[PDB]
Subunit: 159 residues, 6 copies
Amino acid sequence: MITKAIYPGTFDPITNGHLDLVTRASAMFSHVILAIADSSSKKPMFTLDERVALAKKVTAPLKNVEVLGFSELMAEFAKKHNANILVRGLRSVSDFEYEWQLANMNRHLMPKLESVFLIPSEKWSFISSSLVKEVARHGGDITPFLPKPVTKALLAKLA
Amino acid sequence: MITKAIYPGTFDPITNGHLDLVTRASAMFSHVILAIADSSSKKPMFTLDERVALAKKVTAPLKNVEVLGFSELMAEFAKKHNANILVRGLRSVSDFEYEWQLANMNRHLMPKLESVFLIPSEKWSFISSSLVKEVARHGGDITPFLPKPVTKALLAKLA
Amino acid sequence: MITKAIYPGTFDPITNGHLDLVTRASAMFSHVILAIADSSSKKPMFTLDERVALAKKVTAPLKNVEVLGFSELMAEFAKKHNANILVRGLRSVSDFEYEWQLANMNRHLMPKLESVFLIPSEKWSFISSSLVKEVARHGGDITPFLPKPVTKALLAKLA
Amino acid sequence: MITKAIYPGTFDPITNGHLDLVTRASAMFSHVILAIADSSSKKPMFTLDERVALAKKVTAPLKNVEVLGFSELMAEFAKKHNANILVRGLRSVSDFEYEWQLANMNRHLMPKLESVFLIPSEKWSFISSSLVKEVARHGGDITPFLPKPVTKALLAKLA
Amino acid sequence: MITKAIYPGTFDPITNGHLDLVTRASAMFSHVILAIADSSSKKPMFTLDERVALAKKVTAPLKNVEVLGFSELMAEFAKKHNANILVRGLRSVSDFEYEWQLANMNRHLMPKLESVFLIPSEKWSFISSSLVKEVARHGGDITPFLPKPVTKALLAKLA
Amino acid sequence: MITKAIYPGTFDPITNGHLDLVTRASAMFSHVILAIADSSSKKPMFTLDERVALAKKVTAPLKNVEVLGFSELMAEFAKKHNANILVRGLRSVSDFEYEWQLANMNRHLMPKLESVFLIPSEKWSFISSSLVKEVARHGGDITPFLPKPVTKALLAKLA
Ligand SMILES: CC(C)(COP(=O)(O)OP(=O)(O)OC[C@H]1O[C@@H](n2cnc3c(N)ncnc32)[C@H](O)[C@@H]1OP(=O)(O)O)[C@@H](O)C(=O)NCCC(=O)NCCS
Ligand SMILES: CC(C)(COP(=O)(O)OP(=O)(O)OC[C@H]1O[C@@H](n2cnc3c(N)ncnc32)[C@H](O)[C@@H]1OP(=O)(O)O)[C@@H](O)C(=O)NCCC(=O)NCCS
Ligand SMILES: CC(C)(COP(=O)(O)OP(=O)(O)OC[C@H]1O[C@@H](n2cnc3c(N)ncnc32)[C@H](O)[C@@H]1OP(=O)(O)O)[C@@H](O)C(=O)NCCC(=O)NCCS
Ligand SMILES: CC(C)(COP(=O)(O)OP(=O)(O)OC[C@H]1O[C@@H](n2cnc3c(N)ncnc32)[C@H](O)[C@@H]1OP(=O)(O)O)[C@@H](O)C(=O)NCCC(=O)NCCS
Ligand SMILES: CC(C)(COP(=O)(O)OP(=O)(O)OC[C@H]1O[C@@H](n2cnc3c(N)ncnc32)[C@H](O)[C@@H]1OP(=O)(O)O)[C@@H](O)C(=O)NCCC(=O)NCCS
Ligand SMILES: CC(C)(COP(=O)(O)OP(=O)(O)OC[C@H]1O[C@@H](n2cnc3c(N)ncnc32)[C@H](O)[C@@H]1OP(=O)(O)O)[C@@H](O)C(=O)NCCC(=O)NCCS
């Protein structure tokens, strides 16, 4: 039996929370696409190419993980790649509303794609990317929250 | 790659919500144990044997689902059955607290068992077993909420 | 156009929160039944007759409010009284889950009965009956939380 | 006894969720104004005139519903129209905070206007307008979520 | 300036979460009473004397912490001890409702006593005493969740 | 024993909710800095100097409160001022997520700074600054929500 899962997000940038979730998804499913949405209208700090390069560095040890950027409808991209499982995180109760909305919308768009949720380790659940960037903008130490090469890119982006 | 998942609960009795979640788990994983906890101290309405018999009737069409009752530590039962994935439902934000507590406890008890969460269909998410029993006690129609043989057993239990 | 609303609860005992909600419902609808469920299996402190007598004293100034005790299915009682609107309170986010479950169940039981929700005044929203009783058991002052005759009955019940 | 209710919102555009709530309000109250706030500072996709025209098409079968655009304080508009009831939706727990804030503010602005809340059908509760627009921008099917003429206008707005 | 804080609870038994909160309160305030409510009607597993003895062992290194059992109204006990600050934990969003209710009730009972809240370390926030006892009843390892002497007493209580 | 607390925020502008929290913090701690973040990237309505002047007027009666504007990392500012306690508000469950994220981030940035939370009076808990500004923009009365001199400045800012 073969599961092809998609882990979609803007990953701007990939964090230690994302790394925990993709590592766990990697262990459970045959193949995982870490799918990075262009999200142009959402004004990312890093370009799609920069985000893809960071995610590849961070997920390199995971054999059955593939990083792909995409600009289309997520449901269309999943269909294209024959994915049948969408994996998303729930850091705390507050994440539930939007995951429920997305999962219901995706149910309409691609009835065969099942959404499943993982709760990140307690080490990473409080991590908000906006707050990490805010701390970085003020020169605060963000090394615990991001992979090494991500910390390096973020600091460079802000210097 | 082979996933053996456990879907544990008291299932007192199995509802259309449980049926939706086990059917979806059945489609995703190689094998699913629908594991019914004795839960003696939690005072179930149906005996363990009655609950196992109902769950077998309701899950009979699902080839790769096995129904087993258990009285021990859930983590010990999973280890015994070489399960590596625990599947649980999240009906709404309110279910998150207890799933987060259980998942963290289970992480300590069996570090290799991953917990994953499914959100039931909008058709069934509002279903509370206590409220279904309350309605049944007052002679109200509960046919939409439970499989046919479960409705039959519940009505008999209450007549 | 004529609205007959039902405001159902265990009212064990009626509080200043209930009084605020029934007073507001009284102002909006043609007629309001303040319907007191027997709720025998839920072990009320006050008998149904005691609860009905307290609610009558407290709602006496409200011309178009009628207090009735009932032991059947709430939906059946509403049908019996030709009620088309069920009014319930939401004190805070935490009350939402159970109101959503009840409203969906009631939708199945009586499709024509509409449930509508009021948020109690900030003066009363934090009031929990269990906590008021707990404070009363320890001789603490509960006069702000209950109508005068209710405070009198509760104190007598506990002396 | 006569209830004039106001159902205020930005309605950008009116959705099947709004239609469900206004239809239910229509059944309960003598008259309903579906009041569309200009909300200029909130940058709507559709002009006020476009939104009013869509809401009129969608609410045409409801005899006692009137659609009006307004740019002033909602409380002032309600006073102007002698409305005594404000109806708003609660899709899930997450909507509670803002409704509680608005209702308290409106209590100060117009003490006689009562706010009352309806929970939309399970068919529509997960619908977020931002997410529907996002799906539409990517060419995904949004026909289940919006009335036919709204789907038509949205698609045209985005082509 | 001198702060005498009270940290009240049933402490049945004291956990590593309680220890974290009392240690932090100890660092901030001049004196802390760790106040153990008899809570007879709430059916504790450990007697008041057993709970007091466990809390004394666990808080012994904290110079300015005093452990006292009490059976009266918490507000009366605080007044008796001239406490002006009540410290309580918030493990997650789900704890907020009851703390808000208690704090408002305590405001009425003793207007000069201020309630203040601490969030436990991420190491301990998921710990539920009921779930720890449930795991202990089934022979599971609970050593990470309770101080050593508490683990010893609990195991003995259950053997 | 000496507590130096910091109460940080954008205070754009200071509200009666902030005044309640700082007054309570003033009563509990030896010294309180009401610290106003420049928050340039968050586009405040009032300049930092305007916000500092308003906060000084409103906190003038509080002997042990000092108002200071700052543009750096909050943790760095606290270290600079030898603060050991950070005080923040929790108006309702909805505020918990962001306070938990901030508190965890601040734990990493300055391990010795303890965060503690106060719940504002029921009089002020529903107050949202964005909604007060929205009401002010439409000429509605906001006098209950802001100190007198703040109402004066806001009205002038909007005329
Ligand atoms: C991109 C897409 C997957 C959303 O992903 P995402 O959650 O926004 O991406 P990320 O996990 O990397 O995080 C994005 C932002 O929202 C936050 N976020 C993510 N999940 C969240 C949740 N469930 N609740 C609240 N915030 C959340 C992120 O943390 C980040 O905020 P931050 O910058 O402060 O960290 C989704 O919109 C998508 O499928 N895009 C393609 C177009 C499409 O198909 N749209 C319709 C899908 S139904
Ligand atoms: C049995 C066990 C899996 C819990 O399962 P469960 O969720 O209670 O079983 P069910 O899904 O059938 O429901 C049980 C009751 O709690 C409710 N419930 C289930 N999940 C819930 C959630 N996350 N939040 C709130 N309520 C929930 C159920 O609906 C039911 O209530 P109801 O009678 O009104 O319907 C768990 O305690 C267990 O693993 N037992 C074995 C012993 C053990 O190992 N304990 C330690 C595990 S960390
Ligand atoms: C009685 C009935 C209306 C529920 O009412 P109720 O909310 O329990 O009655 P009250 O408002 O007086 O409060 C009952 C208890 O639950 C609490 N409560 C009420 N609404 C709540 C909410 N939505 N969320 C959490 N707790 C709530 C009450 O405060 C009280 O607890 P307390 O003793 O600490 O104060 C309902 O079960 C009923 O319709 N009974 C008749 C039988 C029936 O038809 N059942 C099926 C209906 S779908
Ligand atoms: C317009 C007004 C009624 C708010 O209405 P509204 O809820 O924003 O309008 P809609 O229901 O059509 O939705 C507006 C946006 O916020 C969302 N929303 C609506 N209610 C919500 C809730 N309670 N919680 C979270 N989001 C909500 C909507 O879905 C929409 O977001 P989307 O574009 O992703 O769909 C209100 O601000 C108003 O009265 N305006 C007039 C000026 C005024 O009087 N202001 C002070 C009133 S106290
Ligand atoms: C005892 C008293 C302080 C409550 O304390 P407490 O929170 O129940 O005591 P603990 O922190 O040790 O925990 C008690 C139980 O409720 C849980 N709990 C504690 N705080 C909680 C919260 N805010 N939300 C949900 N559950 C909570 C505990 O974890 C424990 O459950 P568990 O056995 O699964 O672990 C309170 O009722 C009191 O002041 N008692 C004296 C009498 C009185 O004055 N009453 C009126 C006070 S307003
Ligand atoms: C400024 C800082 C303290 C945040 O404070 P703040 O909460 O935003 O300031 P205020 O209390 O005056 O309110 C700011 C806005 O967010 C809202 N808000 C405040 N606390 C909130 C909460 N916990 N949840 C949701 N919204 C909240 C405010 O009400 C206001 O919104 P409004 O304009 O509608 O009223 C924080 O970002 C900071 O420390 N800044 C300095 C830079 C830094 O060190 N960053 C990293 C800290 S971990």
